[PDB]
């Protein structure tokens, strides 16, 4: 049964919830990104109203194979109507296509649900900016105090340096990239940037990027693996035994990998900088975990809950364990205590 904490009061409206079918009082499902945990239950044979980001539409549309009349995309940062409630979508910073919604309730209520996002100082000059706002629905993946990370600035300048190091050292190496889902393009994008190649990768890959309106992704991206010296591949196969299993593959065209894991959180962040991080090596391939975040660290997060000053605080992450429910509250009762709202 859905939980409460994906319904919108005073509405017909439900986020994320797309996996207890028909909710009984729903007239539409928003969609805040393309995450499989977010869209859990979406197939072709959907005949709801679905709202969500152009971007977010085109990877329904093409790769679930839902029929456009049940996809309605909206533009960002526009005031739209929607079964008569304002509404507006905003970028939430997290992968391609990803959105937090603003909602205007009928008695004058403002809600916020912010879907998964990487806070940032930004979003405070957006259309927030311009009222209040009572409800915050908050992605609180890292609500506690453990978790920093670098910026993704830093991530990617790290990244860029290692890669033309070796590749300038060793012209018959390798770099292959990480993935499962849509996120953290950047990182494959900017070593590919630096080194002169498209980036290759499978042909469902292609596919999935094809539909999020980078610009100028025809001279980026290709399915000829022979072609392209930075590789794409499933995070399942980023090992020794599946790397090696890929080394053969290419046919004695590279003698060694030099491959990255962007990784969330990892407990060494505790005790470790981006300047001094090192791989797994056994024999030529090298793995480096790099911590490439598209969630809020725990001061990013607790800046922006501290500029907006909300009322009310529902968590929408880690919220399945009484302790984990317990322990958010308090660090939400110290930001407000501090900044007096
Ligand atoms: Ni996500």
């Given at each position: 049964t859905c939980p409460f904490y994906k319904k919108i009061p005073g509405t017909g409206f439900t986020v994320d919830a797309f996996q207890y079918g028909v909710v009984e009082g729903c007239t539409a499902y928003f969609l805040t990104h393309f995450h499989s945990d977010h869209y859990?239950?979406?197939?072709?044979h959907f005949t709801f109203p679905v709202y969500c980001s152009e971007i977010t539409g085109n990877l329904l549309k093409?790769?679930?194979?839902?029929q456009e009349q049940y996809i309605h995309p909206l533009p960002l940062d526009t005031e739209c109507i929607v079964n008569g409630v304002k509404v507006v979508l905003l970028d939430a910073n997290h992968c391609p296509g990803a959105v937090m919604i603003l909602f205007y309730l009928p008695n004058g209520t403002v809600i916020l649900h912010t879907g998964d996002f990487r806070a940032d100082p930004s979003m405070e000059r957006?259309?927030?900016?311009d009222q209040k706002v009572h409800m915050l629905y908050l992605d609180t993946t890292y609500c506690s105090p453990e978790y920093t990370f670098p910026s993704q600035q830093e991530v990617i300048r790290f990244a860029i340096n290692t890669a033309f190091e070796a590749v300038t050292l060793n012209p018959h190496a390798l770099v292959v990239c990480g993935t499962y889902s849509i996120g953290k393009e950047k990182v494959f994008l900017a070593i590919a940037d630096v080194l002169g190649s498209k980036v290759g990768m499978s042909q469902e890959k292609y596919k999935t990027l094809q539909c999020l309106n980078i610009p100028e992704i025809n001279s980026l991206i290709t399915t000829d693996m022979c072609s392209s010296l930075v590789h794409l591949l499933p995070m399942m196969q980023i090992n020794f035994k599946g790397l090696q299993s890929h080394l053969k593959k290419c046919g004695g065209k590279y003698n060694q990998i030099l491959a990255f894991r962007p990784t969330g959180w990892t407990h060494s962040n505790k005790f470790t900088r981006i300047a001094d991080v090192i791989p797994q090596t056994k024999g030529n391939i090298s793995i480096y975990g790099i911590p490439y975040s598209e969630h809020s660290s725990y001061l990013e997060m607790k800046r922006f809950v501290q500029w907006l000053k909300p009322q009310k605080i529902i968590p929408?992450?880690?919220?399945?364990?009484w302790k984990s429910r317990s322990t958010m509250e308090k660090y939400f009762r110290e930001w407000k205590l501090e900044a007096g709202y």
């Open positions: 859990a239950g979406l197939s072709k093409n790769k679930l194979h839902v957006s259309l927030l900016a929408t992450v880690n919220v399945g364990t």
